């Protein structure tokens, strides 16, 4: 949609002494740089500096300075400039020009509120205020101004306490009374935000729907495979369930690059312009010449000529013949298919070898936008019985009319939804993964390993003992065992997209208490290459563009990310025997 976030960072000496202004600056840089890459046209940014010793404003309101006006879209150059300007302003009045007497930072909110009203007024875009403060109890708020702020502001207040000084006893007031006053308000601690910005930020992709049709068992191929209403809706003895399909696992490509050419510009900014992609077709016409030479002159020698694609036709290969078909035969070459999920039969999970599955998975679920409660109940019962009997169905699956027909395995799966009710609900679905055809099979004969023989089949007695190496390998595998780590239960592996949607795109450390301890499965790890590239780009921007350092000091991979791509350790065990027997010496 359209949102707007406003940053109000305290610059009081209490914030500066414990380095809280630097933490605020780093978090602001991270969030603004993450906003800059998307560069949404409907995401507004504004920054105010509060409790400053001096300030220049047109409104003549002291101790409040608007460093950044309302900006959209936020660009990387704009963010770099804003962060450098913030550094300059903070260093300008860091300690030399300290003020005397405390100032009402809360009042600084009120004027900001007017600006928030002034910029948008009637439009219903989301508005929020992000404020960084050192202490909450030291500030004073007028009782009569609370109602004025509540009636004037319709914006959610997000308060981040930058202080790390809390006693065993806990007591809260002031700001909390404001937090209760304005709905959708909340409080955070700066350490949580600093932790969250350093963790790998996983992406969230909204499901689309890749298929809509019917899952049918026992339908007649006459009515479901004709240029007519091609379902089993007209049935008297068969199983038909309205069904839709969504992506389940899809291979993410790494952060791409732009093939660009350097421009010679007087401004000396090292500018790169992206190239265009134009496709041409060229042929090589032979040429006859008679030149005196001892060689045969059989090297590559032709004249290239570019002709448009309208004069180039596709020649299909059959054995050793490349044939160009007429238009009618090319039309007949396409297989006429019709979308649907035709069940063949049900086999056990172990009766289906794991290597058979050769494609990305997809959710199959009861269609609720064109179906009814009947489809939902039937599909839930089907998935329940498949799960109970450990069945996996084999099916003929077509997604579009003129689309390839696949074979697929349907695995009964259930996804845990918290739901408005206290009791959690396991939503039932199928998971569809393609199975190989006859032409997909590549299985050949490989030489044996355990009791390996010669080519003719004469056994080869390996080594002289099979106790030492076997025991070594068994203890080695026990040493690197990762079964002490738990496994995420079946039901939370796939997460509902609604539970990962938030009212704003602001980086916050998650509103779900169940997100704790989400990093203990060795197999479920973030995209290391994607996060590594993002971290390198962020650090390059931070060091060269704003800090103006002189050499990119490459950051090390984070320990949490490094741990999952590094060998584990259950118990210690020494496998030095191989090197000890081989012997290390400089020859």
């Amino acid at each position: 949609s359209s949102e707007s976030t406003t940053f109000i960072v305290d610059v009081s000496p209490s914030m500066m002494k414990n380095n809280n202004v630097s933490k605020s600056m780093a978090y602001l840089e991270y969030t603004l740089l993450n906003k800059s890459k998307k560069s949404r046209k409907t995401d507004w940014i504004s920054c105010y500096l509060a409790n400053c010793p001096v300030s220049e404003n047109s409104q003549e309101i002291p101790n409040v300075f608007q460093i950044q006006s309302f900006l959209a879209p936020v660009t990387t150059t704009a963010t770099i400039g804003f962060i450098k300007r913030l550094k300059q302003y903070c260093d300008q009045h860091s300690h030399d020009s300290s003020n005397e007497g405390l100032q009402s930072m809360i009042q600084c909110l009120l004027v900001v509120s007017l600006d928030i009203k002034q910029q948008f007024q009637a439009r219903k875009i989301l508005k929020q205020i992000v404020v960084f403060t050192d202490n909450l109890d030291d500030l004073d708020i007028t009782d009569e101004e609370i109602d004025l702020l509540t009636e004037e502001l319709s914006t959610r207040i997000i308060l981040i306490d930058c202080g790390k000084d809390t006693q065993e006893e806990r007591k809260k007031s002031n700001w909390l009374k404001l937090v209760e006053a304005i709905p959708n308000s909340r409080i955070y601690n700066m350490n949580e935000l600093l932790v969250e910005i350093t963790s790998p930020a996983t992406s969230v992709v909204k499901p689309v729907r890749v298929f809509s049709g019917e899952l049918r068992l026992g339908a007649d191929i006459l009515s479901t495979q004709t240029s007519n209403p091609s379902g089993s809706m007209q049935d008297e003895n068969c199983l038909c369930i309205k069904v839709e399909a969504f992506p389940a696992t899809k291979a993410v490509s790494g952060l791409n690059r732009k093939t660009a050419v350097e421009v010679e510009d007087s401004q000396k900014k090292e500018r790169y312009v992206g190239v265009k992609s134009i496709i041409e077709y060229e042929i090589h016409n032979e040429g006859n010449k008679k030149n005196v030479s001892e060689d045969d002159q059989s090297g590559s020698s032709y004249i290239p000529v570019t002709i448009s694609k309208d004069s180039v036709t596709k020649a299909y290969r059959y054995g050793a013949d490349y044939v160009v078909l007429p238009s009618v035969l090319v039309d007949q070459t396409v297989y006429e298919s019709f979308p649907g999920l035709d069940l063949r039969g049900f086999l056990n999970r172990e009766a289906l070898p794991r290597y058979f599955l050769t494609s990305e998975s997809s959710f199959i679920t009861a269609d609720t936008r064109l179906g009814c409660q009947s489809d939902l109940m039937a599909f839930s019962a089907l998935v329940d019985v498949m799960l109970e009997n450990r069945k996996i169905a084999v099916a003929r699956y077509v997604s579009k009319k003129d689309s390839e027909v696949n074979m697929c395995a349907l695995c009964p799966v259930l996804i845990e939804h918290s739901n408005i009710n206290s009791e959690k609900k396991f939503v039932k679905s199928l998971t569809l993964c393609r199975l190989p055809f006859a032409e997909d099979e590549r299985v050949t004969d490989f030489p044996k390993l355990l009791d390996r023989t010669t080519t003719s089949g004469v056994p080869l007695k390996k080594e002289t003992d099979g106790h030492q190496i076997d025991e070594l390998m068994e203890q080695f595998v026990d040493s690197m065992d990762t079964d002490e780590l738990p496994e995420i239960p079946l039901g939370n592996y796939y997460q509902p997209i609604g539970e990962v949607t938030t009212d704003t795109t602001l980086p916050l450390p998650s509103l779900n208490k169940d997100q704790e301890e989400n990093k203990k499965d060795p197999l479920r790890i973030p995209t290391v290459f994607v996060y590594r590239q993002q971290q390198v780009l962020l650090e390059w921007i931070h060091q060269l563009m704003i800090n103006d350092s002189r050499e990119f000091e490459i950051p090390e991979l984070p320990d949490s990310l490094k741990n999952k791509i590094s060998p584990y350790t259950h118990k210690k065990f020494d496998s030095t025997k191989l090197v000890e027997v081989l012997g290390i010496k400089k020859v």
């Binding site: 696992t249 660009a260 004069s311 078909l325 109940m377 039937a378 190989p436 030489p447 509902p496 791509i565």
Partner: protein, 557 residues
């Protein structure tokens, strides 16, 4: 890359003789049918394969002193497939018989071929350089023989000469794939061919290393398996990756590993060629495709750079910095590192597949002790329901990833490991947002009744054998290559405007292999509704009952 097969079929009195176990199919006819089917399959999956077919001893007038070729060692083409199909059709229709076609009659043990000239011809055929096709990278001879004790079997010096010829052929990388035919009434004693086809006897020192190859497996095969033995040997294994497997790098425990693709994804129009036709002259065309910005116009190829976009900022990382960036999580070359081991249930799932599995075998040609170490690893990982978590990249110019390495079960023929890819957190997608959730949360009785009905239906439709890839040809591939085949052979197309309702289902069940199974499923329900038996009649009512529970909710309002 380029492979060649030489079918060499030895005619005998029992060869033309049909078999009761083979259901009125002669071994020679079975071999011809298998060869035709194999050529049809290879024109789809692996074209550019040379196949020759030769028969001996043939008294037929067209011969080479008894070596009659059904077709020479050329790349697969439509003409030879049509030539084989015409012969098969003549045999089936009864216009000609195998006895008549080969001019072979039961006249008291007709002349047998001398094996010396046979192996000389086998060497000559591969050594010849036919101008049409490039040199064969792989060479194989499929030897079909029913005479285990020829004239050369009783000699000794002739055995030495034959063994010398076998060694000479093997030195030219020609590998024999024997199809010795052994019947229940007459076993095939392979001692003679076992002696001839091996590399003789040779000694290096007293305890020195010996030859790693002992020649072809001279184990005879039963006739009923002939076809099963041919189609399963049409394709060599193609190596997908060859990477070091690093078990412990602190103690330098690193072996070699080879990886192949078990099941690919075949698509219809992948193999093609851009041809430019002018008047009556056809030539091949190239498709560059160079990226140039029209505003500049200057040379672009070799002068462009790749820069990371971060909005309106372009980040031009130097190579010396990019390499250090990458080295933080991956090595330069293709590798796999064993990160950990864990139970099979905790890592092996059917709903979290994202890629194609691969098959891994030891590679002892680089890292000594790879085979013995990997055999022990395979034993241990199979002993417990355990796998090995692997981190790394199967190719140097590929992304690092997590994989699961599982020991291959004892049920299948191959020994090795299966490498699946583990989906990353980004790759795992989100379950959609449904518009309703009122399935059976307040209808436990009706939901349970429908559960019972659906389970009852599911119980009988169980697949006994399981999924077999060979029982499902790709319908798009079949239709595409059928159109190509019929255009090349000039065969009139079907689908006239006078189609009938039975004609439609007959065409549908022949164009598609799965549609035949679906018609069987429908016909089972149709038959159950008519069966007078109280047991067979159930499969109707179950389905019938189900259609009520659907309509109980579908059309209430």
């Amino acid at each position: 890359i380029h492979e060649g097969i030489l079918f060499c079929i030895e005619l005998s009195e029992t060869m033309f003789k049909e078999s009761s176990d083979l259901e009125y199919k002669s071994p020679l006819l079975e071999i011809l049918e298998s060869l035709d089917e194999l050529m049809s399959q290879l024109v789809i999956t692996r074209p550019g394969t040379a196949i020759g077919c030769y028969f001996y001893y043939c008294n037929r007038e067209d011969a080479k002193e008894g070596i009659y070729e059904l077709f020479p060692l050329r790349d697969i083409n439509a003409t030879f497939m049509k030539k084989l199909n015409d012969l098969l059709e003549d045999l089936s229709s009864g216009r000609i018989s195998l006895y008549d076609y080969f001019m072979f009659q039961q006249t008291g043990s007709e002349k047998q071929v001398r094996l010396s000239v046979l192996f000389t011809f086998m060497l000559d055929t591969f050594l010849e350089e036919i101008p049409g096709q490039k040199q064969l990278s792989n060479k194989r001879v499929f030897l079909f023989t029913d005479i285990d004790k020829p004239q050369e079997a009783q000699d000794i010096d002739e055995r030495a000469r034959l063994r010398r010829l076998t060694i000479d052929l093997f030195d030219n990388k020609v590998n024999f794939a024997t199809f010795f035919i052994g019947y229940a009434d007459k076993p095939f004693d392979n001692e003679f061919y076992s002696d001839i086809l091996q590399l003789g006897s040779h000694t290096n020192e007293n305890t020195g290393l010996d030859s790693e190859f002992d020649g072809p497996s001279t184990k005879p095969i039963d006739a009923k398996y002939i076809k099963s033995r041919i189609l399963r040997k049409k394709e060599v294994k193609r190596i997908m990756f060859q990477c070091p497997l690093i078990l412990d790098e602190k103690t330098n425990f690193i072996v070699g590993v080879k990886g192949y693709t078990m099941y690919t994804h075949e698509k219809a129009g992948v193999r093609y060629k851009l041809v430019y036709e002018h008047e009556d002259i056809r030539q091949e065309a190239y498709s560059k495709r160079k990226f140039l910005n029209p505003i500049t116009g200057e040379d672009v190829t070799g002068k462009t750079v790749k820069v990371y976009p971060y909005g309106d900022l372009d980040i031009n990382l130097s190579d010396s910095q990019d390499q250090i960036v990458m080295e933080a999580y991956t090595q330069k070359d293709a590798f796999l590192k064993i990160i950990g081991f864990r139970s099979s249930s905790k890592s092996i799932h059917y709903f979290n597949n994202i890629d194609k599995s691969s098959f891994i075998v030891p590679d002892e040609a680089k890292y000594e002790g790879s085979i013995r170490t990997l055999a022990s690893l395979l034993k241990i990982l199979r002993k417990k329901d355990k796998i090995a978590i692997l981190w790394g990249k199967l190719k140097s110019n590929s992304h690092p990833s997590l994989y699961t390495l599982s020991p291959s079960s004892v049920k299948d023929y191959n020994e090795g490991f299966y490498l699946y890819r583990v989906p990353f957190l980004d790759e795992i997608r989100k379950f959609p947002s449904l518009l309703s959730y009122d399935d059976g949360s307040e209808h436990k009785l009706d939901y349970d009744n429908m559960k019972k009905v659906t389970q009852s239906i599911m119980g009988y439709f169980n697949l006994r054998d399981g999924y077999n890839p060979s029982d499902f040809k790709n319908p798009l591939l079949q239709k595409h290559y059928k159109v190509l085949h019929d255009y090349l052979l000039q065969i009139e197309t079907t689908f006239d405007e006078n189609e009938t309702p039975n004609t439609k289902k007959d065409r549908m069940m022949r164009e598609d292999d799965s549609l035949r199974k679906l018609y069987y499923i429908r016909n089972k329900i149709l038959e159950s509704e008519k069966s007078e038996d109280p047991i067979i009649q159930r499969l109707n009512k179950y389905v019938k009952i189900w259609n009520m529970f659907y309509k109980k909710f579908n059309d209430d309002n």
